[PDB]
Design a protein around this ligand. Sequence first.
Ligand SMILES: CO[C@]1(C(=O)O)C[C@H](O)[C@@H](NC(C)=O)[C@H]([C@H](O)[C@H](O)CNC(=O)c2ccccc2)O1
Length: 118
Amino acid sequence: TWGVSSPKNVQGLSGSCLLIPCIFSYPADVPVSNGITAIWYYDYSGKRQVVIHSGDPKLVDKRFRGRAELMGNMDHKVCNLLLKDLKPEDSGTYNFRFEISDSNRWLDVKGTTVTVTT
Ligand SMILES: CO[C@]1(C(=O)O)C[C@H](O)[C@@H](NC(C)=O)[C@H]([C@H](O)[C@H](O)CNC(=O)c2ccccc2)O1
């Protein structure tokens, strides 16, 4: 019962900040010996730019640096994403991924679509 659940659609005004509520889950029998890495991707099937990367921010795309931050407690299985200072180009799909081990990792196939308005 691996899974990720975040809203299908979210809306925000340009210049404003927007939060994407998110929670996830995985089997109680999976050992977690090195924490959980959290990663949010923008337009995964297109440009696939990294929005947030808890294991190493250097992987974060330059256009999202300083404008996106993770408001999630990995221990409580919360992956809320906060996007600050919204821009028209931020419109698109965001998909969350968490990694516990080489084989125990997961990418949400659904994802959340953001729409930025004037
Ligand atoms: C693609 O390979 C992996 C992965 O995400 O690294 C291997 C990983 O072991 C596996 N995790 C588990 C617990 O089975 C993982 C997982 O099957 C996928 O991330 C699930 N998501 C999707 O199937 C998917 C497919 C298309 C688009 C987006 C997501 O695939």
